[PDB]
Design a protein around this ligand. Structure first.
Ligand SMILES: CCCCCCCCCCCCCCCCCC(=O)OC[C@H](COP(=O)([O-])OCC(O)COP(=O)([O-])OC[C@@H](COC(=O)CCCCCCCCCCCCCCCCC)OC(=O)CCCCCCCCCCCCCCCCC)OC(=O)CCCCCCCCCCCCCCCCC
Ligand SMILES: CCCCCCCCCCCCCCCCCC(=O)OC[C@H](COP(=O)([O-])OCC(O)COP(=O)([O-])OC[C@@H](COC(=O)CCCCCCCCCCCCCCCCC)OC(=O)CCCCCCCCCCCCCCCCC)OC(=O)CCCCCCCCCCCCCCCCC
Ligand SMILES: CCCCCCCCCCCCCCCCCC(=O)OC[C@H](COP(=O)([O-])OCC[N+](C)(C)C)OC(=O)CCCCCCCCCCCCCCCCC
Ligand SMILES: CCCCCCCCCCCCCCCCCC(=O)OC[C@H](COP(=O)([O-])OCC[N+](C)(C)C)OC(=O)CCCCCCCCCCCCCCCCC
Ligand SMILES: CCCCCCCCCCCCCCCCCC(=O)OC[C@H](COP(=O)(O)OCCN)OC(=O)CCCCCCCCCCCCCCCCC
Ligand SMILES: CCCCCCCCCCCCCCCCCC(=O)OC[C@H](COP(=O)(O)OCCN)OC(=O)CCCCCCCCCCCCCCCCC
Ligand SMILES: CCCCCCCCCCCCCCCCCC(=O)OC[C@H](COP(=O)(O)OCCN)OC(=O)CCCCCCCCCCCCCCCCC
Ligand SMILES: CCCCCCCCCCCCCCCCCC(=O)OC[C@H](COP(=O)(O)OCCN)OC(=O)CCCCCCCCCCCCCCCCC
Ligand SMILES: CCCCCCCCCCCCCCCCCC(=O)OC[C@H](COP(=O)(O)OCCN)OC(=O)CCCCCCCCCCCCCCCCC
Ligand SMILES: Nc1nc2c(ncn2[C@@H]2O[C@H](COP(=O)(O)OP(=O)(O)OP(=O)(O)O)[C@@H](O)[C@H]2O)c(=O)[nH]1
Ligand SMILES: [Mg+2]
Lengths: 174, 98, 139, 55, 347, 41, 49, 52, 120, 320
């Protein structure tokens, strides 16, 4: 129970290795949604309740769902399987071992310098000490989209309407 | 930096490598793009919650919606390519060499 | 840069074995990069064919580096002239001759002798006179 | 020997030949997304490695 | 497409570019790039052939990958500074990521492969938009963050762009691929002086956009996309081919034409910084671009290729539509060299 | 009269590339109207 | 007349001709007045007169 | 911005999310509010070169 | 260089401190070349549109000329103001930093020993 | 205000003009089959526009003053020369074949223009879709080189693809002996040299390529010479056709706008008829090209542009 965010992050990276080794896209999507679930859990452990539930509802139940639906239509006659290629196994194995080596090095050394400097002193350590009062600071920051973020709403809504128009232009096929 | 950040940035690097190293299917590359976006979302969320940048709490929402719009566009492109060739194989997208 | 630092800090016309090793390392690294790009953009028909192409490019470049280093350093220490661009010119021409041997063609060998010798002499001149390839902005 | 052959060979003919050869190497590409993005991975890795940029 | 929908998509492309150029916040700059790409993809597929679809797909893949890398650079910068303002980057690897992303968006040499194929695969109007308007946003970002770029990385990419644009364009008989390789070389010229003087980058961009607009409008006026099709244009409208020849000479940077101004100013500004070898290399390399420009001029205006019998039909007909601002674009692309000191207005 | 290009001179520029090698022997000039025929239905 | 079809540019576009002449005259008048007031503003800022 | 339309038109389009020491909802403080404020008040108006 | 200059208000083609410089003369050679550029644009417009290049659409060629001169006058003002600003800042910086710009001690060629190189 | 994006945006739609009799009808048949009578009475009684068959000087008729220009400046080919020496070394057979195909492309564009701009239907005598019958007939008789039919296929594929087929394909059926007797009846000495093998090849191309392939995208109406004189019966069968085949039913204003844009632009219509495919029968040398172009430019009203030719009675050049 002492370490929860680290198992979650290691599983996150494992799922990333799994779907980025690119088996047939249905198993890649399964790995992506496993990664998304554990990442939603990660941000739940950081106090990002609304953001993680957004991950769930819109990413895993929306965007993914649509991805798997579209894969179920444009696939191979025998939709492929993970095992069918030695390349998938090699990529997944290399990614898993580079995960294991670096997490072991960071755990037992705490001063790795792979591009960035890292210290696995813990993950609870960086949390600050204070009271947030009678509201969720995350929800207040996100609800400010309609009061502070007028410009953001304007450009995002315009881009979504343009996205509808754009999709209907491209898919017409003439 | 804490080791969760290490693993999140590592996930982004793995998604980038998986996208740059192609295979036959286009959908696999699009899923790698989606993984890159998801790792960006989690990194942004961790940074924003940790430093209590309250107004920046909305930034991950905007990132998610815009990247999903791009994903819809890419899915439509894949569907057009498949209707042309019956598959989403990138090796059929080579007739611009001449 | 450490690959180039180890070549640069050892003085000219001394410790010819060390300088030859450093130039061989530079050659092998450059040949590895060109092999990576060639394998990426013009893929082989098999893994072994790619390994063969990689080894061919790498040995050609490493042999050019080793020959340039040996000839440049030895002609520097033999003549006692470590600041003369002529030793680097001889090195570049010997590198061109071994590139011509690697491609087994006298025309490539002669043209490469001229071009690489002039290039190496220019490099020596730029080292002596502080020419900048990428000059940092100042004004 | 000099004007029609060697003075031609040294400066203009050999330079033109080199430019033509480089043009053939650069221009003739498979037109494959896969090879282009593999080369992109090579370039990205090189910029974050021996080519001292991120440091 | 519907004329209203096409106008809206064009306006959305320009508004994404403007969002990039008017924002102080990195998230809004990323939003502008996203909006530009979203609106740009349909205009590439306006004709809708498999070539157009493949061009759009390759464009989308490169631009989306670049955008994700740009967002990662922004997130690393925020991780180390907590700053969203577009200013110097506070992290070196974030700066490298951002530089590579912006170069991939621009199509610089190590990321140049998409430019020739996409330009060939789309129509001349789409290519005109692609090679003129799409350069503004990444270059403006680069000019804003220029004080923190690694000069070695940028200069490497610019020199490679010049070399590859020169060599790749040597082998082309397709006008769109020739335009794309010329664009790669000119982007290299723009980005070489970027570490030293962003005003020179803006000047070179304006001159290049003028020349590219003039050349693409002449091609659209001619309806020619191959060098042999252009070789018939003398027997229909020789004024177009003579104007095209002077424009190609301008593109080659021949004095006293307008295309010589950016090269001359950039060489001067570089020598001001003890940069002598690189400007000499760049000027020498541009002779390749001038060589295939001169090949096009030979086939188009300076000599007369065989025509066809069916060309007598076209003689009795005028153009239904007329290219806007083409005479102005032609005069600006050829005759403006005496006005060079006005470049200080860009300061 | 002045020499002007004939068909043999014009057809140097009508190929797929400007410098035909073996690796581009299979290259054909692209369609006139930029459209490729539909494949097997 | 001579042509079977009516030429689009067979008669002057009187609205466009008038607009062109008027906008040119306005541009010249505005330029001259701006230069006059600009010389005046320069002379009074610099104390010349 | 490349074209500072916001500072010419007096509009606040995106400057409100640009720092964590800007005004926040319910006056919730940034974690590094004082540190950012001190750095900004040091670096104000002397240019990036001097401020570095 | 000039982007972050103090007082530099956005999107302002001529700032109000430019009104202290002399406006360019009406017969300014650069302005006349601007008009010539407009005239060439009109001629080329006649050529491309397949009209008699010299005598067709005198209102259009005339408008080309006057619009080119109109833009050129303001371009000349902005260019001259930018160069005036450049000189202003250069002199201010030399004044504020006397140690960087010392008063060089002048000497005559009768006390300066220059090396003679024979041509022979 | 030429039909453009601004016209279509406000209120310019073509479906509000399209009707039940807004159809393009092509009448067809071998030589001396009498397509003229059938087409002309069909147009007159069905209230459509007739287009006489596209000749060498059709383009000269739709531009300038509508009068034919010299064969040197327009056409550069002859039909009498083809009937006298069909296997001549000039390449006049395929030069004529390409010129009249280009004239047919121009006429199809002009007819679709009238239909899409006014709403009235048109009737044509032959079209782009039945021009190949003569090309194959000439090929079987060994007139054109095999190189010269590949080029024809290229041009037809890249140009005719852009347009909508006829609603109705009326064909007049006459046997070869009767056609021969009609040619011998009208007395044209050049027509008198037409071999029965040529006419038989034309009829075979009609029956085995043209009529079957129209049958899947239009309704084909075949009459022999007996039922072709009763134009009432022909138009009665024209009015009884469902016309639920081909691309015409699935046409909306968006596609009609693009078709009107292409069809109104004559230089875009003829774009690919001058592809750089160098065949001796149609390639023009640079000296001859330049000379003939200058002589064309010297024509009255042809130098500058319509309305800018003072030498032909054009005023106000300096205000235009
Ligand atoms: C522009 C006008 C486009 C137009 O007619 O839209 C009609 C519009 C759309 O009509 P459509 O039939 O759907 O589309 C036709 C196609 O546009 C094709 O019609 P076309 O063949 O007449 O097109 C010619 C082509 C070629 O372009 C033109 O003919 C005119 C545009 C280029 C010159 C003027 C712009 C640059 C001026 C500053 C240059 C530097 C100084 O036009 C375009 O490519 C237009 C693209 C969209 C507009 C923005 C173009 C920006 C180019 C310059 C970027 C850099 C600027 C400086 C930074 O209809 C309306 O009712 C409006
Ligand atoms: C500083 C500001 C300078 C400009 C001030 C305002 C000038 C007048 C604004 C209107 C105008 O010129 O529109 C041109 C605008 C440009 O389109 P276009 O396709 O070039 O028109 C040429 C046709 O021949 C047009 O022929 P058209 O028969 O259709 O019409 C004749 C045309 C007369 O059209 C012209 O004169 C063409 C435009 C000439 C000047 C264009 C650029 C002006 C700015 C200078 C650019 C060069 C700067 C050089 C220096 C750069 C730095 C070194 O005048 C009008 O349409 C009425 C104008 C008043 C409304 O055309 C129209 O508005 C009519 C279409
Ligand atoms: C078309 C888009 C129209 C958007 C709605 C119009 C503006 C709505 C509004 O009241 O905005 C107020 C807002 C904010 O002003 P405000 O007066 O509500 O103050 C908000 C104060 N805080 C942030 C502390 C809550 O306007 C803007 O932010 C302007 C953004 C640009 C709008 C451009 C529109 C075009
Ligand atoms: C041919 C020889 C001359 C070549 C160059 C010809 C340029 C012709 C067009 C010049 C237009 C004005 C140039 C400057 C400009 O665009 O804006 C000036 C500007 C308008 O705003 P601006 O400065 O944002 O516009 C230029 C963009 N940057 C910031 C990169 C310079 O004038 C100002 O006073 C604004 C300063 C503060 C900006 C914040
Ligand atoms: C793990 C590295 C990759 C490997 O072992 O094999 C990959 C590949 C296999 O060869 P091949 O099937 O020709 O690849 C292209 C297929 N279209 O390998 C190749 O294509 C050649 C790679 C050669 C690498 C040599 C390194 C020294
Ligand atoms: C000079 C040294 C002596 C000559 C060169 C060595 C002898 C030799 O064999 O030369 C010819 C050489 C033969 O090799 P070859 O078969 O052509 O190469 C391909 C093999 N697969 O074929 C070659 O191509 C080698 C050429 C070597 C370089 C020749 C240089 C001399 C010719 C130019 C001299 C004049 C230059 C201008 C002088 C100033 C202006 C007047
Ligand atoms: C291999 C060629 C490039 C070598 C290189 O690193 O160039 C950088 C150089 C400055 O450093 P460098 O002279 O190499 O080392 C000693 C510095 N005191 O900068 C230089 O300009 C010296 C080396 C290149 C000199 C010009 C060579 C020909 C260019 C065309
Ligand atoms: C062409 C294909 C290869 C292009 C890329 C070559 C390598 C580029 C990355 C490394 C550049 C570098 O750092 O070079 C260092 C050296 C001297 O350093 P300098 O260029 O002056 O930059 C100092 C910045 N603080 O300068 C050099 O080494 C000069 C460049 C040598 C290229 C061979
Ligand atoms: C190189 C020169 C560098 C400086 C000038 C820059 C270029 C300026 C002109 C650009 C090209 C415009 C004309 C394009 C062309 O080639 O036109 C061909 C045409 C041939 O004759 P045609 O077409 O029959 O003439 C019709 C009636 N003019 O040509 C012509 O008819 C005339 C071609 C030359 C243009 C006329 C020059 C003299 C005009 C009278 C003096 C003008 C002085 C300026 C002030 C005018 C005040 C009204
Ligand atoms: N070579 C050639 N000749 C053509 C072509 N189209 C029409 N002609 C000629 O056009 C001439 C005009 O006569 P036709 O239109 O065939 O027939 P007609 O005498 O009007 O009689 P009907 O067909 O009954 O109306 C004939 O000599 C045809 O051979 C073509 O594509 N190629
Ligand atoms: Mg007929």
């Amino acid at each position: 129970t002492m370490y929860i965010a680290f198992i979650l992050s290691t599983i996150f990276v494992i799922g990333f290795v799994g779907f980025s080794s690119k088996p047939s896209p249905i198993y890649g999507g399964l790995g992506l949604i496993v990664s998304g679930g554990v990442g939603c859990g990660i941000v739940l452990n950081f106090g990002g309740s609304f953001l993680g539930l957004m991950v769930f509802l819109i990413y895993l139940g929306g965007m993914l769902v649509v991805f798997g639906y579209t894969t179920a239509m444009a696939t191979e006659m025998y939709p492929e399987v993970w095992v069918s290629n030695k390349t998938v196994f090699g990529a997944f194995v290399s990614g898993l071992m580079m995960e294991f080596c670096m997490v072991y090095y960071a755990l037992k050394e705490e001063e790795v310098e792979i591009i960035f400097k890292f210290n696995g002193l813990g993950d609870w350590v960086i949390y600050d000490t204070g009271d947030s009062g009678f509201f969720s600071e995350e929800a207040m920051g996100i609800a400010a989209l309609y009061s502070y973020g007028t410009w953001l709403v304007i450009v995002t809504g315009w881009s979504l309407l343009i996205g509808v128009v754009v999709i209907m232009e491209i898919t017409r096929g003439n | 930096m804490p080791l969760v950040y290490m693993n999140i940035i590592m996930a982004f690097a793995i998604a980038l490598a998986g996208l740059l190293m192609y295979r036959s299917h286009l959908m696999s590359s699009l899923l790698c793009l989606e993984g890159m976006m998801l790792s960006l979302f989690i990194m942004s969320t961790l940074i924003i919650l940790n430093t209590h940048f309250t107004l920046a709490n909305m930034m991950p929402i905007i990132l998610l919606v815009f990247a999903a719009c791009e994903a819809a566009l890419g899915l439509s492109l894949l569907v057009m390519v498949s209707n042309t060739y019956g598959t989403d194989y990138v090796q059929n997208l080579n007739l611009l060499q001449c | 840069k450490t690959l180039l630092h180890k070549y640069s800090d050892i003085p000219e016309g001394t410790e010819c074995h060390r300088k030859a090793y450093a130039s061989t390392s530079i050659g092998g690294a450059t040949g590895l990069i060109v092999s990576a790009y060639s394998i990426a953009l013009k893929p082989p028909a098999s893994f072994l064919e790619g390994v063969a192409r990689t080894g061919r490019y790498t040995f050609t470049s490493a042999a050019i580096g080793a020959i340039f280093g040996l000839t440049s350093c030895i002609s520097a220490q033999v003549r006692e002239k470590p600041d003369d661009p002529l030793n680097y010119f001889i090195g570049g021409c010997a590198g061109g001759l071994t590139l011509g041997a690697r491609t087994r063609s006298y025309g490539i060998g002669a043209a490469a002798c001229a071009y690489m010798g002039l290039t190496a002499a220019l490099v020596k001149m730029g080292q002596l006179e502080g020419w900048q390839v990428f000059a940092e902005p100042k004004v | 020997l000099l004007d029609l052959i060697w003075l031609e060979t040294i400066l203009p003919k050999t330079t033109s030949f080199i430019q033509m050869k480089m043009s053939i190497m650069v221009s003739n590409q498979k037109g494959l997304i896969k090879l282009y993005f593999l080369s992109f991975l090579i370039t990205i890795m090189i910029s974050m490695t021996l080519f001292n940029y991120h440091e | 497409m519907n004329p209203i929908i096409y106008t809206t998509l064009i306006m959305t492309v320009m508004s994404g570019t403007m969002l990039v150029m008017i924002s102080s916040h990195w998230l809004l700059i990323w939003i502008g790039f996203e909006m530009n790409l979203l609106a740009m993809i349909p205009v590439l597929m306006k004709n809708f052939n498999p070539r157009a679809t493949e061009a759009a797909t390759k464009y989308f893949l490169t631009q989306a990958t670049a955008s994700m890398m740009l967002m990662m650079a922004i997130i690393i910068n925020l991780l180390y500074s907590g700053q969203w303002t577009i200013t110097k980057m506070f992290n070196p690897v974030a700066m490298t990521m951002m530089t590579m992303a912006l170069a991939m968006k621009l199509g610089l040499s190590p990321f140049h492969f998409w430019v020739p194929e996409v330009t060939q695969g789309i129509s001349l109007q789409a290519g005109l938009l692609l090679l003129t308007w799409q350069k503004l946003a990444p270059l403006s970002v680069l000019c804003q963050i220029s004080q923190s770029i690694n000069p070695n990385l940028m200069l490497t990419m610019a020199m490679l762009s010049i070399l590859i644009g020169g060599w790749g364009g040597l082998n082309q008989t397709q006008l769109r691929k020739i335009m794309a390789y010329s664009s790669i070389a000119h982007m290299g010229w723009m980005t070489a002086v970027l570490p030293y003087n962003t005003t020179m980058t803006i000047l070179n961009l304006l001159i290049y956009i003028t020349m590219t607009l003039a050349m693409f409008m002449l091609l659209i006026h001619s309806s020619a996309t191959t060098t042999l099709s252009l070789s018939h244009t003398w027997n229909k409208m020789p004024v177009i081919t003579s104007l095209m020849m002077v424009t190609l000479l301008s593109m080659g940077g021949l004095p006293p034409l307008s295309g010589f101004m950016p090269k001359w100013m950039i060489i001067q500004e570089m020598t001001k910084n003890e940069s002598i070898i690189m400007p000499t290399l760049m000027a020498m390399t541009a002779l390749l671009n001038l060589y295939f420009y001169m090949r096009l001029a030979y086939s188009s205006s300076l000599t007369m290729f065989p025509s066809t019998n069916n060309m007598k039909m076209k003689w009795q007909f005028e153009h239904t539509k007329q290219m806007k601002l083409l005479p102005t674009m032609i005069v600006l692309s050829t005759l403006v060299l005496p006005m060079t000191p006005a470049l200080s207005s860009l300061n | 009269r002045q020499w002007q290009p004939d068909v043999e001179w014009a057809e140097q520029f009508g190929g797929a590339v400007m410098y035909p090698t073996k690796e581009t022997a299979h290259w054909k000039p692209p369609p006139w109207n930029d459209v490729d025929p539909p494949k097997d239905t | 007349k001579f042509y079977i079809r009516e030429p689009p540019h067979g008669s002057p576009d009187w609205l466009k001709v008038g607009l062109t002449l008027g906008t040119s005259v306005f541009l010249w008048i505005y330029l001259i007045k701006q230069h006059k007031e600009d010389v005046l503003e320069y002379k009074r800022r610099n104390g010349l007169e | 911005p490349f074209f500072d339309v916001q500072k010419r038109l007096g509009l606040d389009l995106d400057r409100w999310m640009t720092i964590q020491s800007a005004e926040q909802p319910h006056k919730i403080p940034g974690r590094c509010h004082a540190f950012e404020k001190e750095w900004i008040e040091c670096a104000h108006g002397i240019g990036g070169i001097r401020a570095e | 260089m000039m982007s972050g200059r103090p007082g530099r208000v956005p999107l302002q083609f001529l700032p109000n401190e430019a009104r202290s410089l002399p406006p360019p003369k009406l017969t300014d050679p650069r302005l006349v070349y601007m008009g010539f550029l407009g005239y060439c644009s009109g001629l080329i417009d006649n050529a491309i549109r397949r009209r008699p290049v010299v005598s067709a659409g005198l209102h259009r060629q005339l408008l080309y000329v006057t619009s080119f001169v109109f833009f050129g006058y303001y371009l000349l003002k902005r260019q001259d103001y930018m160069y005036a600003l450049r000189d202003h800042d250069m002199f201010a910086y030399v004044k504020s930093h006397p140690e960087d710009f010392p008063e060089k001690d002048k000497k005559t060629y009768g006390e300066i020993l220059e090396e003679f190189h024979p041509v022979r | 205000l030429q039909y453009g994006p601004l016209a279509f945006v406000l209120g310019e739609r073509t479906t509000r003009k399209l009707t039940e009799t807004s159809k393009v009808i092509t009448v067809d048949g071998n030589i001396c089959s009498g397509k003229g009578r059938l087409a002309r009475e069909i147009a007159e009684k069905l209230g459509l526009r007739h287009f006489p068959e596209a000749g060498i000087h059709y383009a000269d008729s739709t531009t300038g003053d509508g009068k034919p220009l010299d064969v040197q400046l327009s056409g550069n080919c002859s039909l009498e020369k083809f009937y006298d020496d069909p296997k001549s070394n000039d390449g006049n057979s395929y030069r004529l074949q390409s010129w009249l195909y280009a004239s047919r492309l121009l006429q199809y564009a002009d007819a679709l223009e009238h239909l899409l701009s006014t709403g009235q239907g048109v009737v044509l005598e032959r079209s782009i879709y039945s021009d190949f019958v003569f090309l194959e007939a000439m090929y079987r008789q060994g007139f054109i080189r095999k190189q010269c039919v590949e080029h024809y296929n290229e041009v037809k594929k890249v140009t005719a693809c852009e347009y909508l087929p006829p609603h109705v394909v009326v064909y007049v059926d006459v046997p070869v002996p009767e056609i021969q007797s009609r040619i011998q009846k009208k007395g044209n000495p050049h027509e008198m040299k037409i071999t029965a093998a040529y006419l038989q090849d034309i009829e075979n191309a009609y029956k085995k390529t043209f009529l079957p392939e129209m049958s899947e995208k239009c309704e084909v109406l075949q009459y022999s010479a007996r039922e072709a004189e009763d134009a009432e019966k022909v138009v009665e069968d024209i009015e009884y056709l469902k016309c639920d085949k081909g691309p015409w039913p699935d046409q909306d204003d968006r596609t009609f706008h693009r078709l009107r844009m292409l069809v109104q632009n004559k230089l875009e219509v003829l774009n690919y008829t001058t592809i750089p495919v160098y065949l001796p029968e149609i390639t023009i040398g640079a000296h001859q090209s330049d000379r003939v172009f200058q002589k064309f430019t010297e024509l009255p009203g042809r130098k500058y542009s319509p309305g800018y030719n003072e030498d032909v009675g054009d005023k106000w050049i300096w205000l235009k």
